[PDB]
Amino acid sequence: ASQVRQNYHEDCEASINKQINMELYASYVYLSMAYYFERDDVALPGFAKFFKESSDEEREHAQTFMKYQNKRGGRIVLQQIAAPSMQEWGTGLEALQAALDLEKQVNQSLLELHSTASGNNDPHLTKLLEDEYLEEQVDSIKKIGDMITKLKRAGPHHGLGEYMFDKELN
Amino acid sequence: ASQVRQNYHEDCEASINKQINMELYASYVYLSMAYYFERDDVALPGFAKFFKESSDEEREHAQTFMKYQNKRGGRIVLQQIAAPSMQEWGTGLEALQAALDLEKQVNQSLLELHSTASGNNDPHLTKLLEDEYLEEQVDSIKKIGDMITKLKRAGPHHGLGEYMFDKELN
Amino acid sequence: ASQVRQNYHEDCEASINKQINMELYASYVYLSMAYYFERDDVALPGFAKFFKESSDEEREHAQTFMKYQNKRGGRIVLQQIAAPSMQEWGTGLEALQAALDLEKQVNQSLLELHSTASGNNDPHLTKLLEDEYLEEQVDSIKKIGDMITKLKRAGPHHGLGEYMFDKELN
Amino acid sequence: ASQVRQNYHEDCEASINKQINMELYASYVYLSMAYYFERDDVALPGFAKFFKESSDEEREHAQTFMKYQNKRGGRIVLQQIAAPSMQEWGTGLEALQAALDLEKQVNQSLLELHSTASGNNDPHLTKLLEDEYLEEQVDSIKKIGDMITKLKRAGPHHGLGEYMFDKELN
Ligand SMILES: [Fe+3]
Ligand SMILES: [Fe+3]
Ligand SMILES: [Fe+3]
Ligand SMILES: [Fe+3]
Ligand code: NI
Ligand code: NI
Ligand code: NI
Ligand code: NI
Numbered sequence: 209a210s211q212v213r214q215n216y217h218e219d220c221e222a223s224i225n226k227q228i229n230m231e232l233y234a235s236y237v238y239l240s241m242a243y244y245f246e247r248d249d250v251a252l253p254g255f256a257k258f259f260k261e262s263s264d265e266e267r268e269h270a271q272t273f274m275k276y277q278n279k280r281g282g283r284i285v286l287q288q289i290a291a292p293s294m295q296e297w298g299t300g301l302e303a304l305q306a307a308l309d310l311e312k313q314v315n316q317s318l319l320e321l322h323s324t325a326s327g328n329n330d331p332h333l334t335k336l337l338e339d340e341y342l343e344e345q346v347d348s349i350k351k352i353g354d355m356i357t358k359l360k361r362a363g364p365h366h367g368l369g370e371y372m373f374d375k376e377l378n
Numbered sequence: 379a380s381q382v383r384q385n386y387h388e389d390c391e392a393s394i395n396k397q398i399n400m401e402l403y404a405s406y407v408y409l410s411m412a413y414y415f416e417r418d419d420v421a422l423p424g425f426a427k428f429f430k431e432s433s434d435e436e437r438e439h440a441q442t443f444m445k446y447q448n449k450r451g452g453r454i455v456l457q458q459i460a461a462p463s464m465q466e467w468g469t470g471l472e473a474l475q476a477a478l479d480l481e482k483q484v485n486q487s488l489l490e491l492h493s494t495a496s497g498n499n500d501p502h503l504t505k506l507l508e509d510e511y512l513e514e515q516v517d518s519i520k521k522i523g524d525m526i527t528k529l530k531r532a533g534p535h536h537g538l539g540e541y542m543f544d545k546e547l548n
Numbered sequence: 549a550s551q552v553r554q555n556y557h558e559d560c561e562a563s564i565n566k567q568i569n570m571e572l573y574a575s576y577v578y579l580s581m582a583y584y585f586e587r588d589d590v591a592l593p594g595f596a597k598f599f600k601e602s603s604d605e606e607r608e609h610a611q612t613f614m615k616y617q618n619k620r621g622g623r624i625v626l627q628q629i630a631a632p633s634m635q636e637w638g639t640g641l642e643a644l645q646a647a648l649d650l651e652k653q654v655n656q657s658l659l660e661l662h663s664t665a666s667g668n669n670d671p672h673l674t675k676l677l678e679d680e681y682l683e684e685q686v687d688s689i690k691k692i693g694d695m696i697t698k699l700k701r702a703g704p705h706h707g708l709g710e711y712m713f714d715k716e717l718n
Numbered sequence: 719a720s721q722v723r724q725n726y727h728e729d730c731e732a733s734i735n736k737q738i739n740m741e742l743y744a745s746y747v748y749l750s751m752a753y754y755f756e757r758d759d760v761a762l763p764g765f766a767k768f769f770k771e772s773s774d775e776e777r778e779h780a781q782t783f784m785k786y787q788n789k790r791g792g793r794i795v796l797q798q799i800a801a802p803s804m805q806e807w808g809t810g811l812e813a814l815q816a817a818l819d820l821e822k823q824v825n826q827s828l829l830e831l832h833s834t835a836s837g838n839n840d841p842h843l844t845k846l847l848e849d850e851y852l853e854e855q856v857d858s859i860k861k862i863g864d865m866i867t868k869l870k871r872a873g874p875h876h877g878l879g880e881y882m883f884d885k886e887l888n
Contacts, residue, residue: 312554334671338671338672349554353419353421353621357418357420358421361538380589381863381866384822384825406626410624413615416618418618437607441583444579448587448588449856451588453635454584456576457631459576459629461626501836501852502848505848505849589863591867591871711871
């Protein structure tokens with residue numbers, strides 16, 4: 209085994225590899241949304257910028273797990289990254305609602321990761337998940353929830369409301 | 379009695395203690411409104427900021443009466459602060475209308491304080507009430523009145539008008 | 549339920565609402581002490597400044613729980629804030645000893661909050677309590693303990709010792 | 719009569735002339751105290767500085783009434799300034815207690831001036847007394863009261879307490 213490995217269970221190492229793929233996939237989904245909103249027949253530059261940032265952050269999130277894997281002495285195994293579930297995302301509200309549910313799906317995965325780490329008495333992994341992932345995930349879900357509510361107030365259907373709300377995201 | 383006390387009637391000292399509690403209560407009401415508007419299903423950041431500032435100011439107003447009480451040689455007596463009348467405040471217009479009526483209720487109390495001070499020939503207390511409270515109260519009522527009118531013009535019902543008007547408060 | 553709510557148990561949401569009230573109450577107690585020490589017949593400006601800062605911090609502590617409640621999708625319920633247990637606090641030592649016991653009462657409540665969060669497998673809430681409350685609480689108790697010891701050394705009874713020790717707090 | 723005089727009653731003009739003399743007298747008393755505390759066998763430089771400032775302020779207070787007299791069209795009449803009641807003032811506490819009672823004697827005179835102005839429907843004179851005299855007088859009495867309390871705590875009798883308290887006034 210690795211000269212550095214200590215108190216690092218095989219199940220946590222495997223779950224990290226799965227979470228790496230999930231972060232890469234979320235990054236890919238947000239990249240799809242980002243350039244969907246730059247289409248000449250969608251033209252929502254604020255939504256495009258918002259999802260491009262989210263795509264970059266999820267790719268950073270995946271790399272933090274990869275660095276973590278190496279730091280604990282595990283071995284990174286990369287799988288294929290699935291095509292995004294959709295290729296057209298509808299209106300801003302429908303993309304936000306899809307993002308909201310993706311984020312809660314990732315949050316579920318992270319809490320199950322924490323349960324695995326807690327069950328194998330790995331306080332270093334539980335600290336990583338609390339400090340770097342579960343905190344950011346709850347804030348993202350709250351931010352998206354706020355945005356959904358604001359967009360519903362401004363007018364969620366392809367109209368002046370969506371046009372004005374898009375400026376708030378720029 | 380206090381070595382500093384002079385021309386300070388027991389009725390004014392008692393009315394100040396009542397006004398302290400009323401200011402603390404108004405502060406609590408505005409704190410309730412402030413974090414009501416930060417709910418993921420309300421998401422009016424401008425209203426939230428407006429009421430958070432008002433909550434801070436009313437707590438400052440209470441402390442100015444407490445300093446005043448001590449300066450005149452009276453004794454501060456603190457009572458319980460009642461729960462806010464409501465826990466959900468509806469739309470922006472309904473919160474502003476509730477704030478407008480709270481502010482005029484506080485103004486009434488202050489004018490009655492002035493009548494007590496004037497009836498006991500306390501020009502120092504009448505000067506405090508005119509310079510530090512009655513001036514600020516009239517300006518607050520005018521500001522809130524302006525806002526109510528502006529929000530009714532922009533569209534008071536959970537729509538684009540309320541969304542845009544909220545940006546003016548940010 | 550809230551679009552953002554996830555892994556947030558009803559018992560934690562209710563305990564947070566109770567802790568909000570306790571923080572508001574501690575803030576009120578420290579406000580009472582603060583302006584007690586600005587009385588013309590007490591005149592301990594250092595103690596007054598120390599308790600005024602503590603009052604501000606406890607009000608900030610309550611707002612962090614309110615933001616937290618909203619972030620997790622719970623609903624803030626505000627109750628009345630009880631009058632402070634006393635209206636006169638004696639000497640500096642007696643106020644510090646009262647503060648010490650209030651702080652350990654709040655610490656007990658927070659550790660029980662952590663037990664509730666830990667029993668419902670809420671690592672996000674346990675992280676909040678460890679990072680933002682239990683750390684600050686232990687440091688506050690140590691600081692107050694140091695001060696009590698220093699004041700007993702300098703001379704705790706209404707004398708030169710209390711007068712000099714008060715300058716250290718300014 | 720004066721080309722500028724308007725709504726200025728003879729009783730207010732006469733009472734202002736009396737208050738001018740009282741301010742000049744208080745200034746003289748504080749000058750006596752100031753150089754009493756610079757005696758080689760008293761040597762309280764902090765008390766000396768405190769009373770020298772108070773002497774300067776009371777002389778400024780007298781000149782503000784003189785400017786006021788001229789502004790309203792009255793005529794300044796200056797009387798003799800009595801010798802200070804004492805020539806030796808004892809300890810710091812005894813000088814502060816004498817100052818406290820002089821300040822409340824001046825405050826009484828000012829409130830009676832306000833009653834004269836209010837009885838003759840002179841809102842300009844009542845504004846002067848509230849804004850420039852009654853406000854400063856209450857703050858001075860509170861400050862002196864605080865100092866008396868602090869000096870009694872530190873030790874009012876010719877000892878280390880008075881020596882240390884004197885440094886706070888420097
Ligand atoms: Fe992520
Ligand atoms: Fe107010
Ligand atoms: Fe706290
Ligand atoms: Fe004066
Ligand atoms: Ni639609
Ligand atoms: Ni409506
Ligand atoms: Ni004692
Ligand atoms: Ni003596």
